[PDB]
Amino acid sequence: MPVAHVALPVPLPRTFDYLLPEGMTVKAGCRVRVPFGKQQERIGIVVSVSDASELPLNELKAVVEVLDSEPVFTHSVWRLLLWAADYYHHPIGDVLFHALPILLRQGRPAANADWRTNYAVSLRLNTEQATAVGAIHSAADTFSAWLLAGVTGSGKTEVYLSVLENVLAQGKQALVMVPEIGLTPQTIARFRERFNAPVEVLHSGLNDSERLSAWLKAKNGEAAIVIGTRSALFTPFKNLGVIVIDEEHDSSYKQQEGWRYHARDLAVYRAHSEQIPIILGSATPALETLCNVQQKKYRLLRLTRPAIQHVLDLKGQKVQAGLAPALITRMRQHLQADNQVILFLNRRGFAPALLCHDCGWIAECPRCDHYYTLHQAQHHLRCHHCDSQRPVPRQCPSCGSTHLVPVGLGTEQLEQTLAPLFPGVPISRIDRDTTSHRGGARILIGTQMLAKGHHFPDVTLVALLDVDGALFSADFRSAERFAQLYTQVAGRAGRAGKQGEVVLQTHHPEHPLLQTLLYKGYDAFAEQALAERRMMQLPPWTSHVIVRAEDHNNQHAPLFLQQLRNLILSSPLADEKLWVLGPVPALAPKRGGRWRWQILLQHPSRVRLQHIINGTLALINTIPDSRKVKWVLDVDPIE
């Protein structure tokens, strides 16, 4: 009598044991229908089969039905999901079901209702592009990870297409991932045209039957290329030969609710498991990717080859609605010409800092010298790093001025205060934030990078009002995000024959990172920022895990996190290189009627930190408050 160890779609980090009735057989990765709870039945996925259970066998119930004779996961996806459930510390049943098409989550048959033998290659690459294609061509049957770095217009997409052509010429399949925002009509029609082979485009418009039909075609070899967003990483393939991740830095590859996986990292694990090349492409590569190049874990392939810009010093200026006087003037010049203007601000929920508008002084924690977070309503400064607290001072202590201003505020009523300064001028946001156009003069308000397929040809002035927020944020990654945005808009501004203008406002135009970025470029900024991350022992040079908790009384969550902190620190694996910081309020400390708190775990070794967390979680029942609180583990947070 075998025992099936079954994963169910429930938020418990365990499997559930069932007996197989005589005559019924099943294997790992097959779905089953099983009893669950008092008198309910659910679909589960068999994780393994053995002849034993931790419970007495006479306490086990029987599997009702086996749904699959062949598994619904290929090996490499199965190995990736089991590895990820452990590394992200997420319930195995939630991981496995989240990776399936909806119809298969529901228990329906994995069924509905070639190009290989005769592949026809249907173009002049430059030297640099041919070197890149050739390097991946020679690397085709073992694992290797490549950063393809080149500004927009340097020909990355043509390298991708030639690599794919070579992969299809081998009779192998390909996976192409693009950001959520990336599946444009032009992009898609481009791919489909180049390949005389079936291409499946997993775009968010697809209904569940079409998503299953594409899954089946990739699994059985009928589709040559699957193009999709972060979840396409779970696509089964018969014979996968390459993975391409376009725009590898984009934050849409990190899932930030439920299972918080990072598709970029999991795609590299998948390439290592399938023993194939993965190409990560970007005009503004993430620091962790540049760190992987410097450490020789990734290989670099570089592709190489005019807007007016002004940096405005805010110090002592008579601002109107957070806009420098000289910027207001420029905006009037462009608006009078019937052109459009984009203002970029920090993201809503940004945790503001406090600085002197006259001399530039920034409020800093005296204990640990990190920049303070300003809480205006409560007239408090609070340190996100060490949790110290001070009243807001009446005077700058460096110069004596009373003109202390918050930095990093979003479009807080700014729509209302911009209408006075620009009467009769329509105002409109452009952020994809729609709670889950083409004309003359207009002011556009943005808070993040535009999509690669998202252009506003009638914009001739971009203003960056997010500089101070980025530089003096309590989030160490904000400068990196700002550098990536700046490089995009500067590149987009007046690509040719359309004179563009970019204006940056800051109280610190001389800031050394900003100077490197503006006059030496992204790559130089990135080398400098990476060196500073290393000195500070921050990601990508150490590993971080944030434990986030919330409550309805501003007491349960910090108490639970204090206790979790002590339990972590008491781990037999906890050494001198482990830091556990906090508890501290989240950078958005309260949303709804909930208080949000966190601790940060930091270690140089990703695997050691994983083992420390594993030992802590095996003892989580030692902290009974763990069930009085909603809490999650966020491994490798992008915060």
Q: Which residues bind Zn ion (CB under 5 A)?
A: 356, 358-359, 361, 365, 367-368, 370, 383, 385-386, 388, 396, 398-399, 401
Strand order in the sheet with 308-313: 308-313, 501-506, 459-464, 340-344, 442-446, 427-429
Of 78, 111, 106, 48, the C-alpha closest to 234 is 78
Q: Give 284 or 373: the residue with its C-beta nearer to Zn ion.
A: 373
* Identity of the residue, 399 or 588, whose beta carbon is nearer to Zn ion in the bound complex: 399
**Tokens coding 433:** 């934030």
Backbone angles phi, psi at 441, to 5 degrees: -55, 140
Residue 156 assigned as binding residue: yes
Q: Is 359 among the annotated ligand-binding positions?
A: yes
**Min CB(364)–Zn ion separation in Å:** 8
SS3 of 376-444: the string is CCCCEEECCCCCCEEECCCCCCCCCCCCEEEECCCCCCHHHHHHHHCCCCCEEECCCCCCCCCCCCEEE
142 in a known ligand binding site: no
- Given a contact cutoff of 8 angstroms between Cβ atoms, the answer to whether 168 and 174 are in contact is yes
The CA distance from 498 to 455, in Å, is: 13
Smaller CB separation from Zn ion, 36 or 476? 476
Q: Minimum CB separation from Zn ion for residue 228, in Å?
A: 43
SS3 per residue for 122-146: CCCCCHHHHHHHHHHHHCCCCCEEE
Minimum CB–partner distance for residue 590 and Zn ion (Å): 21
Smallest distance, Zn ion to C-beta of residue 404, A: 8
Nearer to Zn ion, 138 or 537 (CB): 537
Is residue 396 annotated as involved in ligand binding? yes
Q: In this complex, which beta carbon is closest to Zn ion, that of residue 344 or of residue 372?
A: 372
Nearer to Zn ion, 169 or 386 (CB): 386
User: What are the structure tokens assigned to 284, written together?
Assistant: 């503004």
Residues whose CB is less than 8 angstroms from the CB of residue 360 and which lie 6 or more positions away in sequence, other chains included: 315, 507, 508
* Beta carbon nearer to Zn ion, 71 or 585: 585
CB of 517 to Zn ion, least distance (A): 26
Nearer to Zn ion, 395 or 417 (CB): 395
Pick between residue 220 and residue 395 the one whose CB is nearest to Zn ion: 395
Q: Which two tokens stand for residue 426?
A: 């329509």
Cβ at position 534, least distance to Zn ion in Å: 21
Considering beta carbons, is residue 383 or 418 the nearer one to Zn ion?
383
Is 399 annotated among the ligand-binding residues? Answer: yes
User: Which residue type does 330 have?
Assistant: R
194, amino acid identity: R
Q: Which residue's CB is nearer to Zn ion, number 27 or number 370?
A: 370
| Rounded Cα–Cα distance for residues 598 and 612 (Å) | 18
Min dist. Cβ of residue 379 to Zn ion (A): 18
Is 491 annotated in some ligand binding site? Answer: no
Q: Least distance (Å) from Zn ion to the CB of residue 536?
A: 14
CA distances 91 to 47, 98, 218, 371, 597, Å, are 13, 11, 27, 37, 22
Nearest to 628 by CA among 560, 566, 565: 560
Angle at 574 between CA 569 and CA 576, to 5 degrees: 105
The answer to whether the annotation marks 291 as part of a ligand binding site is: no
**452 annotated as ligand-binding:** no
CB of 369 to Zn ion, least distance (A): 7
**What H or E segment, with its residue span, contains residue 75?**
helix 75-87
Residue 265 Cβ vs Zn ion, minimum distance, rounded to whole Å = 30
150 is in an annotated binding site: yes
* End-to-end C-alpha distance for the chain, whole angstroms: 48
- Minimum CB separation of residue 386 from Zn ion in Å reads 3
Do 230 and 263 meet the contact criterion of CB atoms below 8 Å apart?
Answer: yes
The answer to whether 67 and 43 are in contact (CB under 8 A) is yes
365 is in an annotated binding site: yes
Residue for token pair 């895990």: 545
At its nearest, how many Å lie between Zn ion and the CB of residue 319? 16
Q: Which residues contact 570 (CB under 8 A, 6 or more apart)?
A: none
Q: Which is nearer to Zn ion, 294 or 562 (CB)?
A: 562
One-character DSSP codes across 501-519: EEEEEES-TT-HHHHHHHH
For residues 234 and 372, which CB has a smaller minimum distance to Zn ion in the complex?
Answer: 372
Please, what is the minimum distance in Å from the beta carbon of residue 380 to Zn ion?
Answer: 14
Q: Is residue 383 annotated as involved in ligand binding? A: yes
- Residue 469, marked binder: no
Tokens of 134: 């050739």
Compute the half-sphere exposure of residue 424: CA atoms within 13 Å on the CB side of its CA: 5
Q: Which amino acid is at 287?
A: L
Q: Check the annotation: does 157 bind a ligand.
A: yes
The breaks in the chain (C to N more than 2.5 Å) occur after 113, 122, 305, 436
Cβ–Cβ under 8 Å, residues 227 and 188: yes
Q: Is 368 annotated as a binding residue?
A: yes
Each residue of 51-80: b (16+ CB within 10 Å) or e?
Answer: eebeeeeeebeebeebbbeebbbbebbbbb
Annotated binding residues, written as ranges, equal 150-157, 356, 359, 365, 368, 383, 386, 396, 399
Annotated binding residues for ATP, written as ranges, equal 150-157
Annotated binding residues for Zn(2+), written as ranges, equal 356, 359, 365, 368, 383, 386, 396, 399
